[PDB]
Coordinates of C-alpha atoms in Angstrom, one line a residue:
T1 CA 0.0 0.0 0.0
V2 CA 1.1 3.6 -0.9
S3 CA 1.1 6.5 1.5
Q4 CA -0.8 9.8 0.5
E5 CA 2.7 11.4 0.7
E6 CA 4.1 8.7 -1.7
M7 CA 1.2 9.1 -4.2
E8 CA 1.5 13.0 -4.1
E9 CA 5.1 12.4 -5.4
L10 CA 3.9 10.0 -8.2
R11 CA 1.2 12.5 -9.1
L12 CA 3.7 15.4 -9.3
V13 CA 5.9 13.2 -11.6
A14 CA 2.8 12.5 -13.7
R15 CA 2.3 16.3 -13.9
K16 CA 5.9 17.1 -14.8
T17 CA 5.7 14.1 -17.4
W18 CA 2.4 15.5 -18.9
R19 CA 4.2 18.9 -19.2
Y20 CA 6.3 17.4 -22.1
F21 CA 3.1 17.3 -24.2
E22 CA 1.7 20.6 -22.8
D23 CA 5.0 22.3 -23.9
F24 CA 6.1 20.6 -27.2
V25 CA 2.7 19.7 -28.8
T26 CA 2.3 23.0 -30.8
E27 CA 0.1 24.4 -33.6
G28 CA 3.4 24.4 -35.5
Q29 CA 4.0 20.6 -35.0
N30 CA 0.4 20.2 -36.5
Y31 CA -0.7 19.2 -32.9
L32 CA 1.6 16.1 -32.9
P33 CA 4.2 15.3 -30.3
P34 CA 7.8 15.4 -31.6
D35 CA 9.9 12.2 -31.0
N36 CA 12.1 14.0 -28.3
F37 CA 13.5 17.1 -26.7
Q38 CA 17.3 17.0 -26.0
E39 CA 18.5 19.3 -23.1
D40 CA 22.3 19.0 -22.4
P41 CA 23.4 18.8 -26.0
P42 CA 20.7 21.5 -26.6
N43 CA 19.8 20.4 -30.2
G44 CA 16.3 21.2 -28.9
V45 CA 13.1 19.5 -30.3
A46 CA 13.3 17.0 -33.2
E47 CA 10.5 17.6 -35.6
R48 CA 9.7 13.9 -36.4
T49 CA 6.9 11.7 -34.9
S50 CA 5.9 8.0 -35.0
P51 CA 2.3 6.6 -35.1
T52 CA 3.1 5.4 -31.5
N53 CA 4.2 8.9 -30.3
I54 CA 0.8 10.2 -31.6
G55 CA -1.3 7.5 -30.1
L56 CA 0.4 7.8 -26.7
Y57 CA -0.3 11.6 -26.7
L58 CA -4.0 11.1 -27.5
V59 CA -4.5 8.5 -24.7
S60 CA -2.2 10.8 -22.5
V61 CA -4.7 13.7 -23.2
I62 CA -7.5 11.5 -21.8
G63 CA -5.1 10.6 -18.9
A64 CA -4.5 14.3 -18.3
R65 CA -8.3 14.9 -17.7
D66 CA -8.2 11.7 -15.5
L67 CA -5.7 13.4 -13.1
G68 CA -7.3 16.8 -13.5
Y69 CA -4.5 18.4 -15.6
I70 CA -7.0 19.6 -18.3
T71 CA -10.7 20.5 -18.5
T72 CA -13.4 18.4 -20.3
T73 CA -13.4 21.1 -23.0
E74 CA -9.6 21.4 -23.3
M75 CA -9.5 17.6 -23.6
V76 CA -12.0 17.2 -26.6
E77 CA -10.2 20.1 -28.3
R78 CA -6.6 18.7 -28.4
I79 CA -8.0 15.3 -29.6
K80 CA -10.2 17.0 -32.3
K81 CA -7.2 18.9 -33.7
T82 CA -4.7 16.0 -33.4
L83 CA -7.3 13.8 -35.2
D84 CA -7.9 16.5 -37.9
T85 CA -4.1 16.2 -38.5
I86 CA -4.2 12.4 -38.6
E87 CA -7.2 12.4 -41.1
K88 CA -4.8 14.4 -43.4
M89 CA -1.6 12.3 -43.1
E90 CA -0.6 10.2 -46.3
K91 CA -1.7 6.6 -45.2
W92 CA -1.1 3.1 -46.6
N93 CA -4.1 0.7 -46.5
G94 CA -5.4 2.9 -43.7
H95 CA -2.1 2.7 -41.7
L96 CA 0.1 5.6 -40.6
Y97 CA 3.7 5.5 -41.9
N98 CA 6.8 4.6 -39.8
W99 CA 7.6 8.3 -39.3
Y100 CA 6.2 11.8 -40.3
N101 CA 7.7 15.3 -40.1
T102 CA 5.7 17.2 -37.4
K103 CA 5.6 20.3 -39.9
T104 CA 5.6 18.9 -43.5
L105 CA 3.3 16.1 -42.3
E106 CA 5.2 14.1 -45.0
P107 CA 6.1 10.4 -44.8
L108 CA 9.8 10.5 -43.7
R109 CA 12.6 9.1 -46.0
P110 CA 12.7 5.3 -45.6
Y111 CA 8.9 5.1 -46.6
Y112 CA 8.0 2.3 -44.1
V113 CA 4.8 1.0 -42.3
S114 CA 5.6 -0.6 -38.8
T115 CA 3.3 -3.3 -37.6
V116 CA 3.9 -2.5 -33.9
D117 CA 3.6 1.3 -34.6
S118 CA 0.1 0.7 -36.3
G119 CA -0.8 -2.0 -33.7
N120 CA -0.1 0.3 -30.7
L121 CA -1.7 3.4 -32.3
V122 CA -5.0 1.5 -33.1
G123 CA -5.2 0.3 -29.5
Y124 CA -4.5 3.8 -28.1
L125 CA -7.3 5.2 -30.4
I126 CA -9.8 2.4 -29.4
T127 CA -9.0 3.3 -25.7
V128 CA -9.7 7.1 -26.4
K129 CA -13.0 6.2 -28.3
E130 CA -14.4 4.2 -25.3
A131 CA -13.1 6.8 -22.8
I132 CA -14.1 10.2 -24.3
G133 CA -17.9 9.4 -23.9
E134 CA -17.5 9.1 -20.1
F135 CA -17.0 12.9 -19.8
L136 CA -20.6 13.8 -20.9
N137 CA -21.7 12.6 -17.4
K138 CA -18.4 13.5 -15.6
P139 CA -18.6 16.9 -13.9
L140 CA -17.1 20.0 -15.7
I141 CA -16.4 21.0 -12.1
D142 CA -15.0 17.9 -10.3
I143 CA -12.6 17.6 -7.3
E144 CA -9.8 16.1 -9.6
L145 CA -9.5 19.5 -11.4
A146 CA -8.4 20.8 -7.9
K147 CA -6.2 17.8 -7.1
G148 CA -4.8 18.6 -10.6
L149 CA -4.1 22.4 -10.0
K150 CA -2.4 21.2 -6.7
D151 CA 0.2 19.2 -8.7
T152 CA 0.4 22.2 -11.2
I153 CA 1.2 24.5 -8.2
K154 CA 3.7 22.2 -6.6
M155 CA 5.4 22.0 -10.1
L156 CA 5.3 25.8 -11.1
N157 CA 6.2 27.2 -7.6
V158 CA 5.4 31.0 -7.6
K159 CA 5.8 32.5 -4.1
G160 CA 2.5 32.7 -2.0
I161 CA 1.2 30.0 -4.5
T162 CA 2.1 26.9 -2.2
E163 CA 0.5 23.4 -1.7
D164 CA -1.2 24.2 1.8
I165 CA -3.4 26.9 0.0
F166 CA -5.6 23.9 -1.2
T167 CA -6.2 21.9 2.1
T168 CA -9.9 23.1 2.6
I169 CA -11.0 22.5 -1.1
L170 CA -9.4 19.0 -1.3
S171 CA -10.6 18.1 2.3
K172 CA -14.1 17.7 0.6
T173 CA -15.2 14.6 -1.4
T174 CA -16.9 17.1 -3.8
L175 CA -16.1 20.5 -5.3
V176 CA -19.0 23.1 -5.2
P177 CA -18.6 25.6 -8.0
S178 CA -19.0 28.7 -5.7
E179 CA -16.1 27.5 -3.4
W180 CA -14.1 26.9 -6.7
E181 CA -15.0 30.3 -8.3
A182 CA -13.7 31.8 -5.0
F183 CA -10.5 29.6 -4.7
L184 CA -9.6 30.3 -8.4
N185 CA -10.0 34.1 -7.9
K186 CA -8.1 34.0 -4.5
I187 CA -5.2 32.3 -6.4
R188 CA -5.6 34.8 -9.3
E189 CA -5.1 37.6 -6.7
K190 CA -2.0 36.4 -4.8
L191 CA -0.5 36.0 -8.4
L192 CA -1.2 39.7 -9.2
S193 CA 0.9 40.5 -6.1
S194 CA 3.6 37.7 -6.0
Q195 CA 6.5 39.1 -8.2
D196 CA 8.3 35.7 -9.1
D197 CA 9.6 34.9 -12.6
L198 CA 6.9 36.7 -14.8
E199 CA 7.1 33.6 -17.2
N200 CA 6.2 31.1 -14.3
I201 CA 3.4 33.5 -13.1
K202 CA 2.1 33.8 -16.7
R203 CA 1.6 29.9 -17.0
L204 CA -0.3 29.7 -13.7
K205 CA -2.5 32.7 -14.8
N206 CA -3.3 31.0 -18.2
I207 CA -3.9 27.6 -16.3
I208 CA -6.3 29.6 -14.0
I209 CA -7.7 31.5 -17.1
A210 CA -8.4 28.0 -18.6
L211 CA -10.2 26.9 -15.4
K212 CA -12.5 29.9 -15.1
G213 CA -12.8 29.8 -18.9
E214 CA -14.8 26.5 -18.8
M215 CA -16.8 27.8 -15.8
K216 CA -17.9 31.2 -17.3
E217 CA -18.8 29.5 -20.6
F218 CA -20.7 26.4 -19.4
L219 CA -21.9 27.5 -15.9
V220 CA -23.2 30.9 -16.9
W221 CA -25.3 30.8 -13.6
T222 CA -22.1 32.5 -12.1
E223 CA -22.4 35.4 -14.5
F224 CA -26.0 36.5 -13.6
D225 CA -26.0 40.1 -12.1
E226 CA -27.4 40.8 -8.6
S227 CA -30.9 41.9 -10.0
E228 CA -31.1 38.7 -12.3
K229 CA -30.2 36.5 -9.2
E230 CA -33.4 37.9 -7.5
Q231 CA -35.9 36.6 -10.3
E232 CA -37.8 33.9 -8.2
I233 CA -37.2 31.3 -11.1
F234 CA -33.4 31.6 -10.3
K235 CA -34.1 31.0 -6.5
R236 CA -35.8 27.6 -7.2
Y237 CA -32.9 26.5 -9.5
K238 CA -30.0 27.8 -7.3
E239 CA -29.3 24.4 -5.4
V240 CA -29.9 22.4 -8.7
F241 CA -27.2 24.4 -10.6
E242 CA -24.8 23.5 -7.7
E243 CA -26.0 19.8 -7.5
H244 CA -25.3 19.2 -11.3
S245 CA -22.2 20.3 -13.4
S246 CA -21.9 17.4 -16.0
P247 CA -22.6 18.3 -19.7
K248 CA -25.7 16.1 -19.8
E249 CA -26.8 17.0 -16.2
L250 CA -26.6 20.6 -17.4
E251 CA -28.2 20.0 -20.9
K252 CA -31.2 18.7 -18.9
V253 CA -31.2 21.4 -16.1
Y254 CA -30.7 24.2 -18.8
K255 CA -33.8 23.2 -21.0
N256 CA -36.0 22.8 -17.8
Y257 CA -35.0 26.4 -16.8
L258 CA -35.6 27.6 -20.5
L259 CA -39.1 26.1 -20.6
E260 CA -39.9 27.6 -17.1
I261 CA -38.5 31.1 -18.3
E262 CA -41.1 30.8 -21.2
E263 CA -44.0 29.9 -18.8
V264 CA -43.5 32.8 -16.2
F265 CA -42.6 35.4 -19.0
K266 CA -46.4 36.1 -19.5
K267 CA -47.0 36.8 -15.7
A268 CA -44.1 39.2 -15.3
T269 CA -43.5 43.1 -15.1
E270 CA -41.7 44.7 -18.1
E271 CA -38.8 45.0 -15.6
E272 CA -39.1 41.2 -14.8
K273 CA -39.3 40.5 -18.6
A274 CA -36.0 42.3 -19.4
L275 CA -34.2 40.3 -16.6
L276 CA -35.9 37.0 -17.6
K277 CA -34.9 37.9 -21.2
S278 CA -31.2 38.4 -20.3
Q279 CA -31.3 35.0 -18.5
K280 CA -33.1 33.2 -21.5
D281 CA -30.5 34.6 -23.9
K282 CA -27.3 33.5 -21.9
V283 CA -28.6 30.0 -20.9
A284 CA -29.6 29.6 -24.6
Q285 CA -26.0 29.9 -25.9
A286 CA -24.8 28.0 -22.8
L287 CA -27.0 25.1 -24.1
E288 CA -26.0 25.5 -27.8
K289 CA -22.4 25.1 -26.6
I290 CA -23.2 21.9 -24.6
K291 CA -25.0 20.5 -27.7
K292 CA -21.8 21.3 -29.7
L293 CA -19.5 19.7 -27.1
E294 CA -21.7 16.5 -27.1
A295 CA -21.5 16.5 -31.0
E296 CA -17.7 17.2 -31.3
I297 CA -17.3 14.1 -29.0
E298 CA -19.4 11.8 -31.2
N299 CA -17.6 13.1 -34.3
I300 CA -14.3 12.1 -32.5
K301 CA -15.7 8.6 -31.5
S302 CA -17.0 8.1 -35.1
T303 CA -13.8 9.5 -36.7
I304 CA -11.7 7.2 -34.5
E305 CA -13.9 4.1 -35.0
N306 CA -13.6 4.7 -38.8
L307 CA -9.8 5.1 -38.8
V308 CA -9.5 1.8 -36.8
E309 CA -11.8 -0.3 -39.2
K310 CA -9.9 1.4 -42.1
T311 CA -6.5 -0.1 -40.9
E312 CA -6.0 -3.3 -42.9
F313 CA -3.6 -5.4 -40.7
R314 CA -4.3 -8.3 -43.3
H315 CA -1.5 -6.6 -45.4
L316 CA 1.3 -7.1 -42.7
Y317 CA 0.5 -10.9 -42.0
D318 CA 2.3 -13.7 -43.9
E319 CA -0.9 -16.0 -44.0
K320 CA 1.6 -18.9 -44.7
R321 CA 3.6 -18.4 -41.5
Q322 CA 0.3 -17.5 -39.7
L323 CA 2.5 -14.6 -38.4
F324 CA 3.0 -10.8 -38.4
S325 CA 6.0 -9.4 -40.3
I326 CA 8.0 -6.5 -38.7
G327 CA 6.3 -4.2 -41.3
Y328 CA 6.1 -3.2 -45.0
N329 CA 9.0 -1.5 -46.9
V330 CA 6.9 0.6 -49.4
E331 CA 10.1 1.4 -51.4
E332 CA 10.5 -2.3 -52.7
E333 CA 6.7 -2.8 -52.5
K334 CA 7.8 -5.9 -50.4
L335 CA 6.8 -7.1 -46.8
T336 CA 9.9 -7.4 -44.5
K337 CA 11.7 -10.7 -44.2
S338 CA 11.9 -11.2 -40.4
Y339 CA 8.7 -11.5 -38.2
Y340 CA 7.2 -11.2 -34.6
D341 CA 7.7 -14.9 -33.9
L342 CA 7.3 -14.4 -30.1
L343 CA 4.4 -13.8 -27.7
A344 CA 6.6 -11.7 -25.3
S345 CA 6.7 -8.6 -27.8
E346 CA 4.9 -5.2 -28.1
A347 CA 3.7 -7.1 -31.3
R348 CA 1.0 -8.8 -29.1
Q349 CA -0.9 -5.5 -29.0
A350 CA -0.7 -5.6 -32.9
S351 CA -1.3 -9.4 -33.0
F352 CA -4.3 -9.1 -30.6
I353 CA -6.1 -6.2 -32.3
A354 CA -5.9 -8.0 -35.6
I355 CA -7.7 -11.1 -34.2
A356 CA -10.2 -8.8 -32.3
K357 CA -10.9 -6.9 -35.6
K358 CA -11.4 -10.5 -37.0
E359 CA -8.7 -9.7 -39.6
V360 CA -6.7 -12.9 -38.8
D361 CA -7.7 -16.4 -37.3
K362 CA -8.2 -16.6 -33.5
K363 CA -5.4 -19.3 -33.9
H364 CA -2.7 -16.7 -34.7
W365 CA -2.6 -15.8 -31.0
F366 CA -1.4 -19.4 -30.2
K367 CA 1.0 -19.6 -33.2
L368 CA 3.1 -16.7 -31.6
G369 CA 6.2 -18.3 -30.0
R370 CA 5.8 -19.1 -26.3
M371 CA 9.2 -19.9 -24.7
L372 CA 9.7 -20.3 -20.9
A373 CA 13.0 -19.7 -19.1
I374 CA 12.8 -21.4 -15.6
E375 CA 15.2 -19.1 -13.6
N376 CA 15.5 -20.2 -9.9
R377 CA 11.8 -21.2 -9.4
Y378 CA 9.8 -18.5 -11.2
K379 CA 9.2 -19.3 -14.9
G380 CA 8.4 -16.8 -17.7
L381 CA 8.2 -16.1 -21.4
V382 CA 11.4 -14.9 -23.0
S383 CA 11.4 -12.0 -25.4
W384 CA 13.7 -11.2 -28.4
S385 CA 15.6 -8.4 -26.5
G386 CA 14.8 -8.4 -22.7
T387 CA 13.5 -4.8 -22.7
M388 CA 10.9 -4.2 -20.0
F389 CA 8.9 -2.4 -22.8
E390 CA 8.7 -5.8 -24.8
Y391 CA 6.7 -7.1 -21.8
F392 CA 4.8 -4.0 -20.4
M393 CA 4.0 -1.6 -23.4
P394 CA 0.9 -3.7 -24.0
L395 CA -0.2 -3.5 -20.3
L396 CA -1.0 0.2 -20.9
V397 CA -4.3 -1.0 -22.5
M398 CA -4.1 -4.9 -22.8
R399 CA -5.3 -6.3 -19.4
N400 CA -3.7 -8.9 -17.2
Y401 CA -5.8 -11.8 -15.6
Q402 CA -4.1 -13.5 -12.6
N403 CA -2.3 -17.0 -12.9
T404 CA -2.5 -16.5 -16.7
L405 CA 0.7 -17.3 -18.8
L406 CA 1.3 -13.6 -19.3
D407 CA 0.8 -12.9 -15.5
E408 CA 3.5 -15.5 -14.4
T409 CA 5.8 -13.8 -17.1
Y410 CA 4.9 -10.1 -16.2
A411 CA 6.3 -10.9 -12.6
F412 CA 9.2 -13.2 -13.8
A413 CA 10.4 -10.1 -15.9
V414 CA 10.4 -7.7 -12.9
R415 CA 12.3 -10.2 -10.7
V416 CA 15.1 -11.1 -13.3
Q417 CA 15.4 -7.4 -14.3
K418 CA 15.7 -6.4 -10.6
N419 CA 18.3 -9.2 -9.9
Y420 CA 20.5 -8.3 -12.9
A421 CA 20.3 -4.7 -11.8
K422 CA 21.0 -5.3 -8.0
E423 CA 24.0 -7.6 -9.1
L424 CA 25.3 -4.5 -11.1
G425 CA 24.4 -2.0 -8.3
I426 CA 22.4 0.2 -10.9
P427 CA 18.7 1.0 -10.5
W428 CA 16.6 -1.7 -12.4
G429 CA 14.6 -1.5 -15.6
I430 CA 17.2 -1.9 -18.4
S431 CA 15.2 -1.3 -21.7
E432 CA 15.4 0.2 -25.2
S433 CA 16.6 3.8 -24.4
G434 CA 19.1 6.5 -25.5
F435 CA 22.7 6.4 -24.2
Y436 CA 25.8 8.7 -23.9
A437 CA 27.0 8.6 -27.5
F438 CA 26.1 10.9 -30.4
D439 CA 25.8 11.2 -34.2
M440 CA 27.8 13.8 -36.2
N441 CA 25.2 16.4 -35.1
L442 CA 25.5 15.6 -31.3
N443 CA 22.1 13.7 -30.9
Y444 CA 22.0 10.9 -28.3
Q445 CA 21.9 7.5 -30.0
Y446 CA 19.0 5.1 -29.0
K447 CA 19.3 1.3 -28.9
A448 CA 17.8 -2.0 -27.5
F449 CA 19.1 -2.6 -23.9
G450 CA 17.6 -5.8 -22.5
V451 CA 18.7 -8.2 -19.8
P452 CA 20.3 -11.1 -21.8
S453 CA 18.5 -13.8 -19.8
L454 CA 15.0 -12.6 -20.9
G455 CA 16.9 -11.8 -24.1
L456 CA 16.4 -14.8 -26.4
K457 CA 19.2 -13.7 -28.8
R458 CA 21.6 -11.2 -27.1
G459 CA 25.2 -9.9 -27.2
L460 CA 25.4 -9.5 -23.3
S461 CA 28.1 -6.7 -23.0
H462 CA 28.3 -4.2 -20.1
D463 CA 25.8 -1.8 -21.9
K464 CA 24.5 -0.7 -18.4
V465 CA 21.8 1.7 -19.7
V466 CA 18.9 2.0 -17.2
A467 CA 15.9 3.8 -18.6
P468 CA 13.3 4.9 -16.0
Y469 CA 10.5 4.5 -18.5
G470 CA 10.8 0.7 -18.3
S471 CA 10.9 0.7 -14.4
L472 CA 7.6 2.7 -14.3
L473 CA 6.0 0.7 -17.1
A474 CA 5.7 -2.0 -14.3
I475 CA 4.4 0.1 -11.4
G476 CA 1.4 -2.3 -11.7
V477 CA 3.5 -5.2 -10.5
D478 CA 6.3 -4.2 -7.9
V479 CA 5.0 -0.7 -6.9
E480 CA 7.3 -1.0 -3.9
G481 CA 10.3 -1.7 -6.2
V482 CA 9.4 1.1 -8.7
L483 CA 9.1 3.6 -5.8
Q484 CA 12.6 2.7 -4.6
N485 CA 14.0 3.0 -8.2
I486 CA 12.3 6.5 -8.4
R487 CA 14.1 7.7 -5.2
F488 CA 17.3 6.1 -6.5
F489 CA 16.7 7.9 -9.9
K490 CA 16.3 11.3 -8.0
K491 CA 19.6 10.6 -6.0
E492 CA 21.4 9.7 -9.3
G493 CA 19.8 13.0 -10.6
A494 CA 17.4 11.7 -13.3
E495 CA 14.7 14.1 -12.0
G496 CA 14.2 17.0 -14.5
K497 CA 11.6 19.6 -15.8
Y498 CA 9.6 17.0 -17.8
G499 CA 9.8 14.1 -15.2
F500 CA 12.6 11.5 -15.5
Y501 CA 15.4 11.9 -18.1
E502 CA 15.4 9.4 -21.0
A503 CA 18.0 7.1 -19.4
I504 CA 21.2 6.9 -17.2
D505 CA 24.3 5.5 -18.9
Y506 CA 26.6 3.7 -16.4
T507 CA 28.5 2.1 -19.3
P508 CA 32.3 2.2 -18.6
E509 CA 33.3 2.8 -22.3
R510 CA 31.0 5.8 -22.7
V511 CA 31.0 7.4 -19.2
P512 CA 33.2 10.5 -19.1
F513 CA 36.4 9.7 -17.1
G514 CA 36.4 10.6 -13.4
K515 CA 32.6 10.3 -13.3
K516 CA 30.1 7.3 -12.9
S517 CA 26.8 7.6 -14.8
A518 CA 26.3 9.9 -17.8
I519 CA 22.6 11.1 -17.6
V520 CA 21.1 11.2 -21.1
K521 CA 19.7 14.7 -20.7
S522 CA 16.8 14.0 -23.0
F523 CA 12.9 13.6 -23.0
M524 CA 11.4 11.2 -25.5
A525 CA 7.7 11.7 -26.3
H526 CA 6.8 7.9 -26.6
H527 CA 8.6 7.0 -23.3
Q528 CA 7.1 10.2 -21.6
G529 CA 3.6 8.9 -22.7
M530 CA 4.2 5.3 -21.3
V531 CA 5.3 6.8 -17.9
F532 CA 2.3 9.2 -17.9
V533 CA -0.3 6.5 -18.9
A534 CA 1.3 3.8 -16.6
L535 CA 1.1 6.3 -13.7
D536 CA -2.6 7.1 -14.4
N537 CA -3.2 3.3 -14.8
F538 CA -1.6 2.7 -11.3
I539 CA -3.5 5.7 -9.7
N540 CA -7.0 5.0 -11.2
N541 CA -7.0 1.1 -11.0
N542 CA -5.8 0.2 -14.6
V543 CA -8.5 2.7 -16.0
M544 CA -7.1 2.9 -19.6
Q545 CA -7.1 -1.0 -19.6
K546 CA -10.8 -1.3 -18.6
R547 CA -11.6 1.4 -21.4
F548 CA -9.7 -0.6 -24.1
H549 CA -11.8 -3.7 -23.0
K550 CA -15.0 -1.6 -23.0
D551 CA -14.6 -2.1 -26.8
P552 CA -16.7 -5.1 -27.9
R553 CA -14.2 -6.6 -30.5
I554 CA -11.6 -6.4 -27.6
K555 CA -14.0 -8.0 -25.1
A556 CA -14.6 -10.7 -27.8
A557 CA -10.9 -11.7 -27.5
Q558 CA -10.3 -10.8 -23.8
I559 CA -10.3 -14.6 -23.0
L560 CA -6.9 -15.0 -24.9
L561 CA -5.1 -13.2 -22.0
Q562 CA -6.7 -15.7 -19.6
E563 CA -4.5 -18.5 -21.2
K564 CA -3.1 -20.4 -18.1
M565 CA 0.5 -21.7 -17.9
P566 CA 0.6 -25.5 -18.5
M567 CA 1.3 -27.8 -15.4
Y568 CA 3.0 -30.5 -17.5
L569 CA 5.5 -30.1 -20.5
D570 CA 7.3 -32.8 -22.7
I571 CA 11.2 -32.7 -22.9
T572 CA 12.1 -35.5 -25.4
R573 CA 13.0 -34.8 -29.2
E574 CA 13.6 -36.7 -32.5

């Protein structure tokens, strides 16, 4: 069990991690996240993005709202725009390409379609589809938007603006808009006075501008002048405006106030009619906006659903090997030689969604290579690399059922990975990450760092590159362990503006002499996403998972994860 103090830290890290997207997903990047931002070598923000990057941002957006880092409106918006962009991008049989340029929105040079990239993205979309609906009956003013600002405040740090400020508001199971209006303005005021870094101040203003923004627009019952507040009609509806702040709970309250305005408009003074008329006219638009919000949502859900059923996975499957190829090389109009011949592989998310879409046989799932490695007692599927990501990238959306083959394995991985790492005295979670070497232009290189045990086919080496993203991608399992790693990462200085730096390179060959560890002063959008989502997942009981499985086609197949690990196994040969 996690202490409130503990959680608060995890939440802050989530906030810092979300910031990546806040900051680098620009109009200019066509509302896509760019692969990475490099700090120390300050080459800045790389203007390329992968299907996966994009998907993880979209599900992160949802995740943002979950923690209270954006508003219901803000949410829908970013998704709308990002999707508008997606609906543009040069596709292949309804697939996104390997890479696009964030500005040219052009397929990048080695015109390629990655199976995994598509597979992941599709999943992340399906997740968003089943999720976004929820927010039509989830309050525009809910407590989480305050729990959220708390994290925002801790992060931004601007004088008088301190954590304790909250206390009261957060002490209540519910947030009552009046208290909120007050609290938001109180904070607006101590900001006008506090003379910290104008820049830092600005952000908190705009993040308080955003919060009142939703409220003024959608809860216009705050913007009725003292004479309008008198109209008896208002004094019946006062406690029902406070008791209901969801877009549908408002849609209903707002009509029933607009039909009652109409009724009592005949039995009213010309003074009472002018005041009743002002209130009709405001609450009218306020409804028209809710109708639009509801619509923009369905358009999203529909647009997503489409883009998914448009994605022809058929094309990346060698029917004859009953197996998924790495991806399609568009330049030789040929499918790639090698394949995802293993269950323990990010490919599963691809492999699963295919069967769930009924694009390949339910059998495919069982043709994927299942290899156990019995280490000490614990047994578990080996992967092609040993990267935590190979095992846990699915677990963002793909569920885990207890005692299942996967389950045994998901634990197995954490153990071996933590042993390997304690036996090297580095924090655990060695996975595909950047490391302290650079191309001619001084950009951190990025390579597959497994543990060679879980690494069916591995060059061993010292390659001691611990990436935090991999550690956190398993919060689910050894929360205790991951927490330790996080402290250990802070002490080794991996803490930064946008959460945890890409990786720490302990590798002898590459560490600068008279130093141990070369922190890869980088933030990679895809990894940032995984961390963010994985945190949300941990905090709100595998939410994103339960949303992905809210999809019927997914629920159709959900039994495949409930595969149990066999009790007997032959050993002979021929």
